[PDB]
């Protein structure tokens, strides 16, 4: 049970407001980024301090069940821990459910609603129950930003749709799914990412649109996630100038209790996107910008660059009077009603509670997949070829970033069997590549995400190839955005489109290529 | 935990398939194994388990996820498993999340300056790779490789061995084995009688080994030996032909080699285990159904991944009721994987066991590394330049086959810091693409595998690109035998050389050639 908040030393009681970056490997010498990632020390430090949450990236889920353990058994007072797990568990923690994202059930969505909402609370409810299962209790989803302009390169396929209703109908249904299991939802990146072409990591960008198209278009998902009860609501680093001309929605008294917290009526929990993110850090110093996030109403500093300099710096803003202790208390009570809520659960323990092979998961995330897909109304189909006669090309943002890219993957395998054999290169790559010139099949995975500066733009190098070597066809996995173009460009090009980048949505989409039955790997290790 | 029941209580079938070892991934769900074609489903590995399989041998997963995986493989057989890996450098070569080795030859290198060192190195890894094996519940070590490396061209051992002479691999060998000897596994000489002279891979196809009987006690086996008379469990045969010892038939299917050279003149008492028989160089040779009762009249005791299960089974009761092979027969195998499963007779205690950060495990890796690091002989540092001005090139044998370039992994950021933006690309592609004319640093993972036909040779196509562009340098981790060339064709060109290819091993490289990022997701 949680003590009393008033048992709380004052310096205890700001620590639970700030929530620090982990990696999911156990071990310091596996961080990915550990500029970002507290060694073991640490956080094991920041933990017996009194630090209110954790935020978890990498690893494969039996790891993570053991990572989120070693965690709280650090902790007198449990653990928020938290993960971006938008697409499923699975999607950050191998071994448990990847779900395609959320545009693929938006895609559904617009012929077949109440399907599509049907899908999407089963993905909220079996991302809440793998969650619980690795120890994870704070989901940071849904996305209800309405990607209404194409070129967004940071939200793009992360949203569930580009207009409010298509939004508002698939994110609460994700929520209604989630609220089976006792975890945290959140909704992100109020009061909306949606139409912007700024990736707010590397730069902030400003949404000029007047009050009346806020509250028409970028407000009403949200409006509908808090009167559906979501836990917390997830800041974007955004100009808003028709509400605040002066300080980012972050930092800004007009938008985070004027809009959220007064005017919304929001109860729950207010967070920070990362403070560690270029739209904010080029904004601020870090140091005034904590100060000036709880000034502005947030309950949550997330990942502030430095967190022993945090809480000092809060420390003398209330001995100036610049904040006061109450402040800082009334924050702490909304913390208690969240972590009340995830203390209700029964302990769930891997691989218990993990779908797995479970047949209505994988028949769930296969059904998505196909409703989703679209392709050149055509009648043809890929030529097989004898063995290595032609090329199977494939295409990413980045190799380091391919994590659907393993050996012997249905995008590799399955052409192999019709005589295409594989190359991978990155798009940056490719218009310098030479290509022989013998049957080509290509495939581009690319897609927006977190540190995009722009969106891949793979046209004009395809219609370069196109003239260079007979190009057979070309297959999309992730952004649609791109398809009007390559229809338009080289109409006599048929091609093939998923919003999946996972083995499944591989095989659905390769295996429908061909009309002759494979032919004839011999490689085990 | 109960004691082994008496051989003759399992019936026939039983005995048979206690000789039998599948294959399966580490990975808990059907959906994720790499090789379904391979590696057998959960349905599947239930039901051979609860028949009487004798072991699983894994690959794929986490160290956490193989824990789990042997838990759940243990818990639905009667007799305990052999569970199985190679886990030739380090278990975390394997799995990750354990410790992963610098490769043998490093060692190797090692102990032509400095054996003393070289052998308390290759007990220490013996030691840990024996100790995180048995905290995820793996108990059967596939390894030292044995192998004596003296044909430079090898693509399949290559750096995986110890060494270039008998001498050498016999001594870190049984470092390795005693080592490993601190702890209840077994452990497994390979590829008797030895497959370092060759330049063909069996994977692919059957290599031949012409030497006479005296090279072969002169090179080959010395190192065999000393593991045998030093206690190793298990002995792993290549599948190759050894005309001086058998006309016909490869060591895997051969009397005379199995039986008449290692049970008998070598005096090997252990596990005689086949290499997998789902290689092209031995299913190339016979059928499967040939192939298993075959190897079984040789001596094998252990079939090692038969192409099918169901299918060896029937086959080896068939062959009994017909008089080519005897009852007997088979009863006697099962008592030495008795002999063997008693030696390691017990719960998989993951991450206790595991060396994670540990500070003299971690430093022992280092120190392996920056000992067997190979350099121009002055000392170099490279131009830094304005961010994404120049350009680093990693270049790599395959991209599916590359897990140590990892986002934000150090050959990759340290670089950047200097102005070089990263580009990936596979050997093979390398000659079409055409370079833009700024300064470039190359670095080459390229090393001997499993499934290399030949050895990568990059020599001519950095020849053609240096001629080209501004090149600043060239980094090879892996293999060191392209090296000569390297300094003959290009000698005004750096260049720095690692055995290792792990994010240590790119941090210490790439840090020397200076001193000597935004992205959280």
Same mark, same amino acid.
């Given at each position: 049970?949680?003590?009393?908040?008033?048992?709380?030393?004052?310096?205890?009681?700001?620590? %639970?407001?700030?929530?620090?970056?982990?990696?999911?490997?156990?071990?310091?010498?596996?961080?990915?980024?550990?500029?970002?990632?507290?060694?073991?020390?640490?956080?094991?430090?920041?933990?017996?301090?009194?630090?209110?949450?954790?935020?978890? =990236?990498?690893?494969?889920?039996?790891?993570?069940?053991?990572?989120?353990?070693?965690?709280?058994?650090?902790?007198?007072? *449990?653990?928020?821990?938290?993960?971006?797990?938008?697409?499923?568990?699975?999607?950050?923690?191998?071994?448990?459910?990847?779900? *395609?994202?959320?545009?693929?059930?938006?895609?559904?969505?617009?012929?077949? @609603?109440?399907?599509?909402?049907?899908?999407?609370?089963?993905? /909220?409810?079996?991302?809440? %129950?793998?969650?619980?299962?690795? /120890?994870?209790?704070?989901?940071?989803?849904?996305?209800?930003?309405?990607?209404?302009?194409?070129?967004?390169?940071?939200?793009?396929?992360?949203?569930? /749709?580009?207009?409010?209703?298509?939004?508002?109908?698939?994110?609460?249904?994700?929520?209604?799914?989630?609220?089976?299991?006792?975890?945290?939802?959140?909704?992100?990146?109020?009061?909306?990412?949606?139409?912007?072409?700024?990736?707010?990591?590397?730069?902030?960008?400003?949404?000029?649109?007047?009050?009346?198209? =806020?509250?028409?278009?970028?407000? @009403? @998902?949200?409006?509908?996630?808090?009167?559906?009860?979501?836990?917390?609501?997830?800041?974007?680093?955004?100009?808003?100038?028709?509400?605040?001309?002066?300080?980012?929605?972050?930092?800004?008294?007009?938008?985070?209790?004027?809009?959220?917290?007064?005017?919304?009526?929001?109860?729950?929990?207010?967070?920070?996107?990362?403070?560690?993110?270029?739209?904010?850090?080029?904004?601020?110093?870090? +140091?005034?910008?904590?100060?000036?996030?709880?000034?502005?109403?947030?309950?949550? =500093?997330?990942?502030?660059? +430095?967190?022993?300099?945090?809480?000092?710096?809060?420390?003398?803003?209330?001995?100036?009077?610049?904040?006061?202790?109450?402040?800082?208390?009334?924050?702490?009570?909304?913390?208690?009603?969240?972590?009340?809520?995830?203390?209700?659960?029964?302990?769930?323990?891997?691989?218990?509670?993990?779908?797995?092979?479970?047949?209505?998961?994988?028949?769930?995330?296969?059904?998505?997949?196909?409703?989703?897909?679209?392709?050149?109304?055509?009648?043809?189909?890929?030529?097989?070829?004898?063995?290595?006669?032609?090329?199977?090309?494939?295409?990413?943002?980045?190799?380091?970033?391919?994590?659907?890219?393993?050996?012997?993957? *249905?995008?590799?395998?399955?052409?192999?069997?019709?005589?295409?054999?594989?190359?991978?290169?990155?798009?940056?790559?490719?218009?310098?590549?030479?290509?022989?010139?013998? *049957?080509?099949?290509?495939?581009?995975?690319?897609?927006?995400?977190?540190?995009?500066?722009?969106?891949?733009?793979?046209? +004009?190098?395809?219609?370069?190839?196109?003239?260079?070597?007979?190009?057979?066809?070309?297959?999309?996995?992730?952004?649609?955005?791109?398809?009007?173009?390559?229809?338009?460009?080289?109409?006599?090009? @048929?091609?093939?489109?998923?919003?999946?980048?996972?083995?499944?949505?591989?095989?659905?989409?390769?295996?429908?290529?061909?009309?002759?039955?494979?032919?004839?790997?011999?490689?085990?290790?």
């Amino acid at each position: 049970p949680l003590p009393p908040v008033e048992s709380l030393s004052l310096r205890q009681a700001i620590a %639970q407001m700030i929530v620090v970056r982990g990696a999911g490997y156990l071990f310091d010498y596996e961080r990915p980024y550990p500029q970002w990632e507290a060694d073991q020390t640490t956080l094991q430090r920041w933990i017996e301090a009194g630090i209110g949450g954790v935020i978890l =990236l990498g690893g494969s889920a039996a790891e993570v069940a053991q990572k989120t353990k070693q965690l709280q058994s650090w902790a007198e007072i *449990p653990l928020l821990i938290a993960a971006d797990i938008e697409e499923g568990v699975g999607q950050r923690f191998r071994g448990a459910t990847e779900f *395609p994202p959320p545009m693929a059930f938006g895609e559904i969505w617009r012929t077949d @609603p109440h399907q599509a909402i049907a899908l999407a609370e089963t993905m /909220g409810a079996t991302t809440a %129950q793998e969650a619980l299962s690795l /120890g994870i209790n704070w989901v940071l989803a849904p996305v209800l930003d309405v990607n209404n302009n194409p070129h967004n390169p940071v939200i793009n396929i992360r949203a569930f /749709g580009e207009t409010p209703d298509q939004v508002s109908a698939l994110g609460t249904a994700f929520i209604r799914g989630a609220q089976q299991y006792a975890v945290l939802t959140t909704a992100k990146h109020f009061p909306g990412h949606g139409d912007t072409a700024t990736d707010s990591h590397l730069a902030l960008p400003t949404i000029s649109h007047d009050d009346t198209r =806020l509250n028409t278009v970028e407000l @009403p @998902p949200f409006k509908a996630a808090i009167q559906g009860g979501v836990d917390a609501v997830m800041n974007a680093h955004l100009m808003i100038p028709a509400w605040d001309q002066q300080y980012p929605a972050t930092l800004s008294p007009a938008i985070l209790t004027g809009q959220l917290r007064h005017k919304l009526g929001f109860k729950g929990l207010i967070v920070t996107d990362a403070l560690v993110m270029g739209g904010i850090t080029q904004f601020a110093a870090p +140091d005034t910008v904590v100060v000036q996030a709880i000034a502005a109403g947030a309950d949550i =500093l997330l990942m502030p660059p +430095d967190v022993d300099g945090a809480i000092i710096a809060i420390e003398t803003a209330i001995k100036t009077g610049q904040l006061s202790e109450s402040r800082i208390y009334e924050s702490v009570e909304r913390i208690w009603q969240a972590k009340q809520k995830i203390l209700t659960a029964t302990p769930s323990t891997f691989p218990q509670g993990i779908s797995g092979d479970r047949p209505e998961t994988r028949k769930t995330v296969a059904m998505v997949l196909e409703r989703a897909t679209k392709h050149q109304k055509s009648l043809v189909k890929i030529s097989s070829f004898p063995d290595n006669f032609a090329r199977n090309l494939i295409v990413v943002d980045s190799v380091l970033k391919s994590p659907f890219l393993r050996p012997n993957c *249905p995008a590799i395998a399955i052409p192999q069997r019709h005589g295409y054999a594989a190359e991978i290169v990155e798009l940056k790559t490719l218009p310098r590549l030479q290509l022989e010139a013998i *049957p080509t099949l290509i495939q581009c995975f690319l897609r927006g995400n977190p540190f995009t500066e722009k969106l891949a733009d793979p046209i +004009d190098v395809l219609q370069k190839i196109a003239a260079q070597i007979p190009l057979q066809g070309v297959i999309f996995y992730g952004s649609p955005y791109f398809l009007e173009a390559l229809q338009t460009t080289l109409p006599e090009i @048929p091609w093939w489109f998923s919003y999946g980048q996972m083995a499944i949505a591989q095989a659905e989409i390769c295996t429908s290529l061909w009309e002759e039955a494979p032919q004839a790997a011999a490689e085990f290790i």
